[PDB]
């Protein structure tokens, strides 16, 4: 019993150090000496949970509770295990039981708060975190998770004080070599130093290294040349997001456009098949597709990669949901590169390169990254919009001349227009204009009444609000629409006679400084409106109130989050997109540019704050990039007042989304291929990774 206590206490310290194998051995020894040791069972369970041995963990949590029925911490931690098994009901039953046993138990309230947040109940998550902090005022995990909840709903009460405290918490945790409470993916939202952001990432990367060290794997032996692969470079794309996810919406065409004479493409899915066409396409077009979600053990999964003989292993998750960076910690390939899916450094020694570009990641700030910079020649960003939304390549309008009040798009648009009596062609290449006649009145009536669809001259004419009722795969971007679609300002309650500024990002990317810039722009441009999304809806009244305090009178119009195709299509109704400087639109940036909408941006220092500028630079619209806040406001106001200049800039975006490299997936793949061969030839000549420009 006292012998068991010493073993348990030692195990606890071994665990804090990341010596997982030794911790497990010691807990098991403690239980051998004292079988009825509830704390030892619970501690062993927690380390088993950390290793992914969820059923074995459960068994030990239950044993702890059988021994001590009021062991609130066992229930709390059992709840986390059930949550990891996707058993939300079981998780809530355990958290609520823990809180019933001990209502003053801060950790349980914090765990309950997290599952509320994950479920989409932000107000209850906020409340539970505030309870946790009331009970234990020094609780870094709860404070930082609360800070993100408040960010999500644009609650900026004591914002500057909150930001200072977050930085203080991180400093203190890094100085004591604890895992920081700010998640790496969230670190770009807070005014932390580049050193601190890199250090956060590094500590999270180290969790993966600790988990793989239990396996006792030697270094893998890596190919020195391309002899076994018939002169083909074997590239492995590892992602949890081959499916309906923004990353597939960016790169689903890339695997299939690789040159099979020089490349062999392996796609390693970390997620099961979600039934979507995105997954179908990558599975069909990759040379090889391997479902690693079927191989939960990271040792056997990493062996699976090494057999395939991969030269370049590409990490598309970083520290996003579904990552299995334990696979990369094992180094099953000689070159390992970060690409596209994660807008930051891994901070980890097991990743060699980050694929970026000179606009996103200039040489100056190379200390921000642990990896070496590998530059793509234009932008590292890419979008599959040309393939997914080819019906948006051309448009027509109805003259109720405006390009963005009443818009038609469709694969068969040309044939429909050719069936109409008096269509006017406005040169920009050109925009057809349907004059106000009986046919135009039929279309406007469909929209006003909220009808799903009509037929004109045998052509199917669809209401853009009803896409999920007509073809749900066309709504998600899984299929191209087979009808002509109508999109109007009146559908979204937008003004017919004023400038529409838009931003379609999640509201967490907005901060007080940003909303102040936007208010300043709106005050300078009479009648204009700012179009935002209910992303989530509970953020709306906070935004509206802070805007009221800055002096804005119904100048901000919210719309619901839409299905993918509608979201992209409705961007055609805006005049100008106002990008979020804190963290730019990434996928959302590509979406707005595909509609022909100019985006004003102010590049910061973080990778996440510079993506929009890189997109615009590739597009060829340097005039939309601001060097400071005054320039951002001046650019936006000029676009909203100088209507000939707006027309020119919109025409430039409309043309250059086709003529520039930005959406050209073939050109991108070929450039990516050149970069892979540089990486390979550099390594084949015995060299360590170095920067590449």
């Amino acid at each position: 019993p006292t012998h068991a206590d010493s073993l348990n206490n030692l195990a606890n310290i071994k665990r804090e150090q990341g010596n997982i194998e030794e911790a497990v051995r010691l807990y098991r020894k403690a239980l051998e000496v004292f079988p009825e040791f509830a704390a030892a069972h619970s501690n062993l369970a927690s380390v088993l949970q950390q290793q992914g041995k969820l059923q074995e963990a459960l068994m030990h949590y239950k044993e702890a509770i059988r021994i001590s029925p009021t062991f609130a911490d066992a229930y709390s931690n059992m709840g986390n295990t059930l949550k990891e098994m996707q058993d939300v009901q079981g998780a809530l039953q355990c958290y609520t039981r823990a809180i019933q046993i001990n209502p003053a138990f801060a950790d349980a309230h914090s765990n309950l708060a997290s599952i509320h947040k994950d479920s989409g109940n932000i107000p209850e998550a906020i409340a539970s975190y505030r309870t946790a902090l009331k009970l234990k005022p020094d609780f870094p995990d709860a404070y930082c998770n609360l800070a993100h909840c408040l960010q999500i709903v644009c609650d900026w009460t004591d914002y500057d004080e909150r930001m200072k405290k977050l930085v203080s918490i991180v400093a203190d945790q890094l100085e004591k070599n604890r895992l920081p409470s700010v998640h790496p993916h969230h670190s770009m939202l807070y005014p932390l130093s580049h050193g601190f952001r890199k250090a956060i990432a590094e500590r999270h990367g180290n969790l993966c290294l600790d988990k793989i060290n239990v396996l006792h794997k030697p270094p893998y032996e890596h190919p020195k040349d391309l002899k076994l692969s018939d002169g083909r470079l074997r590239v492995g794309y590892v992602s949890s997001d081959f499916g309906n996810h923004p990353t597939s919406h960016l790169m689903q065409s890339i695997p299939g456009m690789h040159n099979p004479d020089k490349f062999e493409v392996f796609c390693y899915a970390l997620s099961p098949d979600d039934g979507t066409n995105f997954r179908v396409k990558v599975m069909a077009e990759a040379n090889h597709f391997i479902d690693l979600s079927q191989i939960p053990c990271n040792g056997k999964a990493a062996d699976r990669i090494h057999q395939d003989g991969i030269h370049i292993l590409v990490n598309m998750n970083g520290y996003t949901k579904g990552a299995r960076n334990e696979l990369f910690a094992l180094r099953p390939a000689p070159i390992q590169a970060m690409w596209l899916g994660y807008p930051g450094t891994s901070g980890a020694l097991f990743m060699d390169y980050i694929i970026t570009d000179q606009e996103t990641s200039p040489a100056e700030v190379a200390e921000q990254y642990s990896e070496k910079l590998a530059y793509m020649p234009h932008t590292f960003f890419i979008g599959d919009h040309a393939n997914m939304f080819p019906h948006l390549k051309k448009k027509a309008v109805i003259d109720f001349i405006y390009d963005n009040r009443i818009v038609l798009n469709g694969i068969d648009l040309k044939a429909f227009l050719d069936s109409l009596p008096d269509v006017k062609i406005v040169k920009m290449l050109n925009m057809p204009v349907i004059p106000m006649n009986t046919i135009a009145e039929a279309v406007i009536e469909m929209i006003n009444r909220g009808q799903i669809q009509i037929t004109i001259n045998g052509f199917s004419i669809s209401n853009g609000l009803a896409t999920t009722q007509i073809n749900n795969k066309a709504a998600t971007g899984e299929e191209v629409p087979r009808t002509i679609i109508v999109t109007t300002r009146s559908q979204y309650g937008l003004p017919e006679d004023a400038i529409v500024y838009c931003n379609f990002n999640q509201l967490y990317k907005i901060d007080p400084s940003t909303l102040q810039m936007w208010a300043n722009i709106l005050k300078r441009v009479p009648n204009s409106v700012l179009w935002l999304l209910r992303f989530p809806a509970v953020g709306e009244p906070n935004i509206q109130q802070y805007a009221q305090n800055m002096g804005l009178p119904n100048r901000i119009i919210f719309s619901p989050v839409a299905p993918k195709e509608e979201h992209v299509r409705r961007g055609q109704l805006a005049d100008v997109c106002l990008d979020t400087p804190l963290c730019n639109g990434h996928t959302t940036g590509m979406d707005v540019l595909w509609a022909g909408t100019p985006m004003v941006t102010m590049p910061g220092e973080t990778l996440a704050s510079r993506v929009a500028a890189s997109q615009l630079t590739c597009l060829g619209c340097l005039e939309l990039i601001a060097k400071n806040r005054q320039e951002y406001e001046d650019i936006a106001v000029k676009l909203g007042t100088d209507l000939e200049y707006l027309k020119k800039v919109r025409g430039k975006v409309w043309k250059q989304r086709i003529s520039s490299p930005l959406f050209n997936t073939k050109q991108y793949t070929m450039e990516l291929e050149r970069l892979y061969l540089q990486m390979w030839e550099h390594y084949a000549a015995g060299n360590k990774p170095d920067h590449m420009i």
């Binding site: 998640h183 790496p184 923004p246 520290y319 996003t320 949901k321 990434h586």
Partner: peptide, 7 residues
């Protein structure tokens, strides 16, 4: 319903 990039 709307997938996003998340931590």
């Amino acid at each position: 319903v709307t997938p996003v990039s998340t931590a």
